Structure formats: structure tokens, C-alpha cells
């Protein structure tokens, strides 16, 4: 039926229905603007009024103004007639290529895969990125998390993965841009048309795009994470297919939450966040998963505010991943890209029974010398290298090489590194370190291992200097 | 020949592992080519029995809404409420 | 407990005219078929795409090395 706006503040609006009253989650439809202004019920305040989160600007609304119930959730296009199309948070298309004629629809909200549907299929997914492979490998159909503070190189890394992975990949990929840079989208689009994962000519397109960037209202950023969610969901279930879900940046989802939780009228929780940060997340999060039916390999970039890895946002999210890659400004500032913290990135499959105890052994051997170097880090800073015992003078030099040989010039920042984009296969990864560790190379300069491919390019470099 | 026998009990063990794999291949193929129908009949007996027990609904919403003689069996069973409770 | 044991019988005077009405799943309409094909794809997935009625032949492979 019909009801009216009685309160408006930011993205929170209060509608009064005399007849009937929409379930919590029903997309409402504002009647009176040149622009589809979906509200979304989130509360029943009583006195036959509901409280809703907008999905766009609310300049203009007035106390009065009619609203129609849609009788349903926000529902969007799903199916194969999405591949190649850019769609926004409510399904509307935004690549200015007409409408998205599609058989079926789905709602953005949805209960999550019951326990019986889970699958324990753990098979390694090689990236050709030395640190990731050697120390905390990604797992096929696993949840992956990229943690980073402003500017440490999440977006680059997600891109390199999209390249070393979703280019030679028989199967559908969905990319949800949640509250990041609009120009990064324009950039993706073009980059994927040229490379031809998207094709304007055909229906040979292998990717769907869902975008709600850092210029749109809380509501929109709040939700869009789920739009793109729903899409990937279909390709998994009604297609029992291999889905690749990339999000950037999942943080902006919790953030946007925070912006609204204030006026929804919850009482503030730790650090000002919404009371409901763990579940708000966890519902949404647990839908992103590989089930018996289909299979989603997820890769989410996670922003870390003020570099605070304990900020509730990043802090809570860790629970939800199977492999994590954590980026430190500290490292990046030493020109060690990709900026991966070797002692803080982990995978739930670094396990000899899964990766074969040559892998597991060279790993924890690097991970050891590094964390041995790291302990000396203090005495070296106050007294200097010389006060270091002879044994220890080495543990440094070797470690420092490892430190340097985990750097790897990506095929993207061929522009910042200038250097040619390498991709190193698990074998030569595992090998090279093993050698470095067994000190075949204590005769080579440090630099020799900074920014290279296999260990050859290392020993090779060392010559061109001499 | 010590450095030369770890490899002679590696090959005598790297074939023990491939000849065991081919023996569980046929299982993972054979028992599968029919455990399939274990499911092509599973979704079938249920789904049908969905529409079947659900079909019940729409024929009973037709029984009360229609049959003005199913408005008499209304006041009936219901006045047998007030009583018992007390 | 005496005006309720026979209302549970409005449920097999229909259960009856159903598990006997042969001629196809009753009154289906289009819906009935389409969906019984989508779940015919995904259930044809975890297993493979080959012939489910025949006994599979056998390609074999040598032992790799690390």
C-alpha cells in the first residue's frame, strides 16, 4: 500500500503506513523523484512506522511524500545475461548499455549455507607470487584476505592476482567494487575489454561487475557488497560452476555500517563502531563460501584504519579467512614489494600432509631465520652490527637475502618498478629459498636477490654488477 | 651406496603409491556412475512430494472458501473450545 | 482431544485424490518442468559429464616426481 515520510536524516528515513506494514527487509519505493530511490526497511518502531536505510541521496525528500511497498527485498538481475555488464547496488545497469534482460531475479539478502553443505576440499592454488606460494598459499575455492593500510598495495596485489589467475581460467568471475575509487572502475572496465574478459560484441564475457564506490551514501556502500555477493551466489548454485569473487574493499562495508548505525539509533560500541559489527559481517561473510554444489574462490581486500590491525573491522574479519596476506607500511617503505609480512601472513593449509614436507620445511625454515633476525633487530639498532656474535652476523646476512628474495616485480607495476613482470612457479620458489637457506649464496651481494624471478635471475644479477 | 639406496627405496615406494591410486580410481568412477541415480531419484521423490503435499493446501483452501457447508463445520469444532478449557 | 482427531482427516481425502491421480504430476503448469532441469544440471556436476549408464573406460597415468 502507501505510507509517508515522517522523519528524514541522512540515509535514515521514517515511513508511516496506516494500512499494512512491510516486513523488515522490504525494499520500499519513493514516489516523487526523477530517480529510483529505494528505501530498505530495517526496523519497526511501532505506532505503525518503520525505519529504513536509503540507497541513495535523500536531498529533497519531505515530511509528507508517499512511499510504496515493493512486497519484496531489494531484488536484482542474476544469470548469464549479467556477464560483461556493470550493474549498481539495486541491479540497475550503469554501463549505459540498455537494460539487463534476464530470466530470473534474486534478493540481495539470503540465509547462509547450512552445515551439511560445507565442503572440506583443500587443494592448493598457486599464484606465482613467491611469498604467497612459499609461506601461506591460497586454496582453491577458499576465502582469501588482503590486509593493508592506506597505500601498502592491496589494490595492486588484487590486480596481479586477477591477472595471474582469472585470465587463464575456464569459469565465471565476479568483481564487486565496494566503496573504493570510481576511477579504479573505469580503469578495470577498459583494462578488461582490451584484454577481452568482457566483450561488448558477444555474450562470450566471463566476468560480472558490481560497483558501489566511495562517492555513494552509506546505505549504498552498506549494501552493494551484497549485490555482487548475490550474483556470485547464482553462478555457484544454479550452474554448479567455478566462481571467482573479487571484492575491493570489504572494509568499506563495515565502515558504511558504522556511518548509519549512529542514526538507526543503536548505542555505539567499541571505538564507535556499530553494536552489530560481528554478525552484520558474519551473515554477509558466511554467504561467500564454497559449498558442495558450486565453488567460490574469494579474494577480499581489507583496509586497515590508521594501520591498526586491532581495529574491530580488520580485527573481526580475520576469523573468516583460510589464507591471509598482511601488508605492512614498514616493509613497503623499504621498497620491499609486494609488502608482505612473512611472519603475519598465514594459511590454514601450510601443512606437510597438504603441501608436502619439502614445502612445509623450506617455509618454516625461512619463517625461522626471519624471526631470528627480527629478534636481533633491537641490539643491532642500539650497539650496531659489530657487537653481533659471529654466528649471528650470518643469521642476519642470510635472512636479509630471504627478506629480499621475497620481493617480486609484479606484471602490473611494471610502471613503478620499471622492471619486467615476473611470475615464479612453486617448484623454483621452493628451490631457490632452499638454496639460499643452505647458504649456497653467501657469496652474492644483497641486492642480487631484490626484485627478481627464479634464483637464476638472482645469481645472474650478481654478475652484471661485478 | 647409502646416498644411492634412499632412491632405490623411493622408486620401490613411488610406484607403491601410484598402483594404489589406480585401484581406488575404479571405485571413485564406478560407484559414482550409479550413486548419481541415488540422487536423480532423490530430488524426484521429494520435489514431487512437495507439489504433492502442497497441492493439499490449495484444495483445502478451496474446500473452506467454497463449500458453504464448510462454514457449518466451522462454528462446530470451535464451540468445542470454550467448553473443554474451563 | 475429541474435536480435533478428525480434522486431521481433511488431509488424506486429498492425499488420496493425489497419490492415485496418474497422468502426470497434477496440474503442474510450466513451472514444474523448468526447475526439474536446473537441478538436473548441478546434480550432473559433482560427478562429471560422461555417460552415467555405461561403465567408464580407463585412461591411466605414470608416477610423477618431486
Amino acid at each position: 500500500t502507501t505510507g509517508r515520510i515522517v522523519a528524514v536524516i541522512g540515509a535514515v528515513v521514517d515511513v508511516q503506513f496506516d494500512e499494512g506494514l512491510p516486513p523488515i527487509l522490504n525494499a520500499l519505493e519513493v514516489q516523487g523523484r526523477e530517480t529510483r530511490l529505494v528505501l530498505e526497511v530495517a526496523q519497526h518502531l511501532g505506532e505503525s512506522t518503520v525505519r529504513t536505510i536509503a540507497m541513495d541521496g535523500t536531498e529533497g525528500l519531505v515530511r509528507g511524500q508517499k512511499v510504496l511497498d515493493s512486497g519484496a527485498p531489494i531484488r536484482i538481475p542474476v544469470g548469464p545475461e549479467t556477464l560483461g555488464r556493470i550493474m549498481n547496488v539495486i541491479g540497475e545497469p550503469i554501463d549505459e548499455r540498455g537494460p539487463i534482460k534476464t530470466k530470473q531475479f534474486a534478493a540481495i539478502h539470503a540465509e547462509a549455507p547450512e552445515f551439511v553443505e560445507m565442503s572440506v576440499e583443500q587443494e592448493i592454488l598457486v599464484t606465482g607470487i613467491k611469498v604467497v606460494d612459499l609461506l601461506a598459499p591460497y586454496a582453491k575455492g577458499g576465502k582469501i584476505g588482503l590486509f593493508g593500510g592506506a597505500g601498502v598495495g592491496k589494490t595492486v596485489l588484487i590486480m596481479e592476482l586477477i591477472n595471474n589467475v582469472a585470465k587463464a581460467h575456464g569459469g565465471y568471475s565476479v568483481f564487486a567494487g565496494v566503496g573504493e575509487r570510481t576511477r579504479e572502475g573505469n580503469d578495470l572496465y577498459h583494462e578488461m575489454i582490451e584484454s577481452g574478459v568482457i566483450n561488448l560484441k558477444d555474450a562470450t564475457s566471463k566476468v560480472a561487475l558490481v560497483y558501489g564506490q566511495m562517492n555513494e551514501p552509506p546505505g549504498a556502500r552498506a549494501r552493494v557488497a551484497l549485490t555482487g555477493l548475490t550474483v556470485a551466489e547464482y553462478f555457484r548454485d544454479q550452474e554448479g560452476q567455478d566462481v571467482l569473487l573479487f571484492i575491493d574493499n570489504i572494509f568499506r562495508f563495515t565502515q558504511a555500517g558504522s556511518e548509519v548505525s549512529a542514526l538507526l539509533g543503536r548505542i555505539p560500541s567499541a571505538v564507535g563502531y556499530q553494536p552489530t559489527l560481528a554478525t552484520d559481517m558474519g551473515t554477509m561473510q558466511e554467504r561467500i563460501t564454497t559449498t558442495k554444489k558450486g565453488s567460490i574462490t574469494s579474494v577480499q581486500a581489507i583496509y586497515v584504519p590508521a594501520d591498526d590491525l586491532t581495529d574491530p573491522a580488520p580485527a573481526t574479519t580475520f576469523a573468516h579467512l583460510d589464507a591471509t596476506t598482511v601488508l605492512s607500511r614498514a616493509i613497503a617503505e623499504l621498497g620491499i614489494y609486494p609488502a608482505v609480512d612473512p611472519l603475519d601472513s598465514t594459511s590454514r593449509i601450510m601443512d606437510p600432509n597438504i603441501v608436502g614436507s619439502e614445502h612445509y620445511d623450506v617455509a618454516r625454515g625461512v619463517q625461522k631465520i626471519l624471526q631470528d633476525y627480527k629478534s636481533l633487530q633491537d641490539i643491532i639498532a642500539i650497539l650496531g652490527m659489530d657487537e653481533l656474535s659471529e654466528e649471528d652476523k650470518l643469521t642476519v646476512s642470510r635472512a636479509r637475502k630471504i627478506q629480499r628474495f621475497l620481493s617480486q616485480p609484479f606484471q602490473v607495476a611494471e610502471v613503478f618498478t620499471g622492471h619486467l613482470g615476473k611470475l615464479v612457479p612453486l617448484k623454483e620458489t621452493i628451490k631457490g629459498f632452499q638454496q639460499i637457506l643452505a647458504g649456497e649464496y653467501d657469496h652474492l651481494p644483497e641486492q642480487a636477490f631484490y626484485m627478481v624471478g627464479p634464483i637464476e635471475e638472482a645469481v645472474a644479477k650478481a654478475d652484471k654488477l661485478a | 651406496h647409502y646416498l644411492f639406496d634412499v632412491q632405490r627405496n623411493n622408486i620401490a615406494m613411488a610406484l607403491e603409491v601410484t598402483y594404489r591410486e589406480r585401484l581406488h580410481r575404479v571405485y571413485r568412477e564406478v560407484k559414482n556412475r550409479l550413486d548419481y541415480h541415488i540422487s536423480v531419484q532423490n530430488m524426484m521423490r521429494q520435489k514431487e512430494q512437495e507439489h504433492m503435499i502442497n497441492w493439499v493446501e490449495k484444495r483445502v483452501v478451496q474446500s473452506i472458501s467454497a463449500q458453504q457447508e464448510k462454514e457449518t463445520i466451522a462454528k462446530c469444532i470451535a464451540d468445542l473450545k470454550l467448553l473443554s478449557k474451563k | 482431544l475429541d474435536p480435533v482427531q478428525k480434522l486431521f482427516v481433511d488431509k488424506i481425502r486429498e492425499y488420496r485424490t493425489k497419490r492415485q491421480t496418474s497422468g502426470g504430476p497434477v496440474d503442474a503448469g510450466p513451472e514444474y518442468q523448468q526447475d526439474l532441469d536446473r537441478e538436473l544440471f548441478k546434480l550432473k556436476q559433482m560427478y562429471g559429464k560422461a555417460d552415467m549408464n555405461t561403465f567408464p573406460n580407463f585412461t591411466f597415468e605414470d608416477p610423477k616426481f618431486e
Partner: peptide, 28 residues
């Protein structure tokens, strides 16, 4: 070399029932 030595030590129904039934180191 020895790590590759320690991983290995650890390891119509009647048309299917009737149809159901490396040494160069002695050199180098």
C-alpha cells in the same frame, strides 16, 4: 631428498557388476 622419503610412508546394476569383474639409479 629425504623429505621425499617421509611423505610416502604415510598413506542396470547388473551391467556394472558383470563388467566390474624407472631405474637409471642402478646407473647414475
Amino acid at each position: 631428498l629425504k623429505s621425499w622419503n617421509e611423505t610416502l610412508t604415510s598413506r542396470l546394476v547388473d551391467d556394472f557388476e558383470k563388467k566390474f569383474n624407472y631405474t637409471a639409479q642402478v646407473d647414475a
